[PDB]
């Protein structure tokens, strides 16, 4: 009955934990004990982008590393040129409560979603020249937290109804549904090959999902509270998580366990966004105390601070060639750092 | 070609400057508690109310996207203690700590609230009404610091004069905010 199955689950959990403990040969800190420290990282604001009325919830760079999209809760989507501070597109939304945005790898599409439980796909390259809603995907039960285009016809969404989904924009129907979480899914990160992805949720756990087979492969449980952001290491064999316990953590897919923890004694606010630099040596992390921090990911000590915002930092991102870092904030200003 | 890029940018900003005027002239109201957006207008001023009944029972993640509304409208009809607990957790939230609450006691005792036997304001119904109002007001007037207040009302009718009340407390909220900013209150 219930008791026998619960006992079997407890036995399996102990078996998994001891199998993981058998492989903890050494620590990351001892292996990187003889590594020269990064130094001190001083970054400077190059551009400041001002066109939004309300707080900003999301941003996403393009593949050309020059154009970018941003979402604000006044009901607005804006596309900027980062070099010259122009405004290529401004798109008014049907709903004013938007929590996510994304950029297609080809550059012809953008996406958004929020408290309307819908994902809206916008076609930038209209033949007539005007941006119109190309598609409206609606099968989720709770709000949307994140979305990431795989290609021009596939997209992955995460919802506050504790499920993730893979869509088919041509037909607008769910192809695979990923159901293993017991709390809101808050973020997701596609692998460099786009064959797997990871998702962090409010049950204080993260999961690795196989896109083709639609099954969960590994679960990682180190945090203590809800996970807010999740990134993917450049070679796709590790990832990093930031949560409400005011810590970041690094996990390895091959060792199936946590490697490093990035925290300090005077940081008691939750992390809202994380990102990696091009070589994977620097971990950037946005906080609730209105500024971002830079972590030497191989040694777990701070190397710089990005303090330029007057309100909570909501979004943070690094370009593909790795030259600039954009951050958004609840004070309605985006800032680019170099 | 840079001239055309500047021209398109200037068109974008010319539209955004017109959008800013409409956005700043509306008041946005959350309608949690009981009974998705609905715009309306009273005495030539526009209000915009949102009812979020399409979500699930866990609120701690989508509640904070309402940190800049003018007021929250909390409707309440042990079902009184859960309402008191939700009011307490909304009142003390870090992102909703400057938002005022318009409270509508739609219920218009000694076993579940044993302190009713030592409470003095048929007079029994009025005594019960003011006991419940005083419960919510004892929660509200505890950790405000003067940045928000609670406006309790008693409603049981067809809800005719319920929109004049929202108008009159949304006026008071802004008047007190400015008088406090100018160091006059």
């Amino acid at each position, epitope marked *: 009955e219930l008791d026998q199955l619960r006992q079997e689950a407890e036995q399996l959990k102990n078996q998994i934990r001891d199998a993981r403990k058998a492989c903890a040969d050494a620590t990351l800190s001892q292996i990187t004990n003889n590594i020269d420290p990064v130094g001190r990282i001083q970054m400077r604001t190059r551009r400041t982008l001002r066109g939004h009325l309300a707080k900003i919830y999301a941003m996403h760079w393009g593949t050309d590393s020059r154009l970018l999209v941003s979402a604000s809760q006044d009901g607005k989507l804006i596309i900027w040129d980062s070099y010259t501070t122009n405004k290529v597109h401004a798109i008014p939304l049907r709903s004013s409560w938007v929590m996510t945005c994304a950029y297609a790898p080809s550059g012809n599409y953008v996406a958004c979603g929020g408290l309307d439980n819908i994902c809206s796909i916008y076609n930038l390259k209209t033949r007539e020249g005007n941006v119109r809603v190309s598609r409206e995907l609606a099968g989720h039960t709770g709000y949307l937290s994140c979305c990431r285009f795989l290609d021009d016809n596939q997209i992955v969404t995460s919802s506050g109804d504790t499920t993730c989904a893979l869509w088919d924009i041509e037909t607008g129907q769910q192809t695979t549904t990923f159901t293993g979480h*017991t*709390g809101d899914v808050m973020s997701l990160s596609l692998a460099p090959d786009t064959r797997l992805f990871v998702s962090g949720a*409010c*049950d*204080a*756990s993260a999961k690795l999902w196989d896109v083709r087979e639609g099954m969960c492969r590994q679960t990682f*449980t180190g945090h*203590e*509270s*809800d996970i807010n952001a999740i990134c993917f290491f450049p070679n796709g064999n590790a990832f990093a998580t930031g949560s*409400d*316990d*005011a810590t970041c953590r690094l996990f390895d897919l091959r060792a199936d366990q946590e490697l490093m923890t990035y925290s300090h004694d005077n940081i*008691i606010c*939750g992390i809202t966004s994380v990102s990696f630099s091009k070589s994977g040596r620097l971990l950037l992390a946005g906080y609730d105390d209105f500024n971002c921090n830079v972590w030497d990911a191989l040694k777990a000590d701070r190397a710089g601070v990005l303090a330029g915002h007057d309100n909570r930092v909501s979004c943070l991102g690094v370009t593909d060639d790795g030259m600039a870092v954009a951050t958004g904030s609840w004070d309605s200003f985006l800032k680019i750092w170099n | 070609e840079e001239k055309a890029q500047r021209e398109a940018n200037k068109k974008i900003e010319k539209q955004l400057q017109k959008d800013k005027q409409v956005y700043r002239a509306t008041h946005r109201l959350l309608l949690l508690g009981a009974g998705f957006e609905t715009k309306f207008q009273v005495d030539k001023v526009n209000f915009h109310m949102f009812d979020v009944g399409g979500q699930r*029972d*866990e*609120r*701690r993640k989508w*509640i904070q996207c309402f940190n800049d509304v003018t007021a929250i409208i909390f409707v309440v009809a*042990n079902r009184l*203690q*859960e309402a008191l*607990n939700l009011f*307490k*957790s*909304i009142w*003390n*939230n*870090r992102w909703l700590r400057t938002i005022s609450v318009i409270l509508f006691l739609n219920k218009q005792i000694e*076993d*579940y*609230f*044993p*302190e009713f036997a030592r409470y003095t304001t048929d007079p029994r119904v009025t005594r019960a009404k003011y006991f419940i109002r005083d419960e919510f007001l004892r929660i509200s007037t505890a950790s405000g610091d003067g940045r928000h207040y609670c406006y309790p009302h008693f409603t049981c009718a067809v809800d005719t004069e319920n929109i004049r009340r929202v108008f009159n407390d949304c006026r008071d909220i802004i008047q007190r905010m400015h008088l406090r900013q100018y160091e006059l209150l």
Partner: nanobody
Amino acid sequence: QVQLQESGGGLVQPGGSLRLSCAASGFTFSNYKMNWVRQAPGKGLEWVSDISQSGASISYTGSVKGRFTISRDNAKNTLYLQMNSLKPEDTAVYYCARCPAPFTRDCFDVTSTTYAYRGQGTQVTV
């Protein structure tokens, strides 16, 4: 991983006393305030009591006030409930719950149908 295991309970005559215990692991006990929640057979989950990070603030639901006592032991990482002078209305399943985030003063979603940081509960029949 966050774990909360409840112990104590059983069948008792009216007027008797019980002591429920909740052992916690997988997090720092001292940064969180903890609650006792209860579900009666036939109704939904109902809040019962809560206590703060150190034990200064204690709150009870009205019906149980005066005859339930909550306490916590941060050194041994445990939470208690002393329940004397029980009544037949008290037969229910008792769960030990934790606030979502540390250092905060608002406890949200602790009595939902699906919460992630509450135990499996013990049965108390009177």
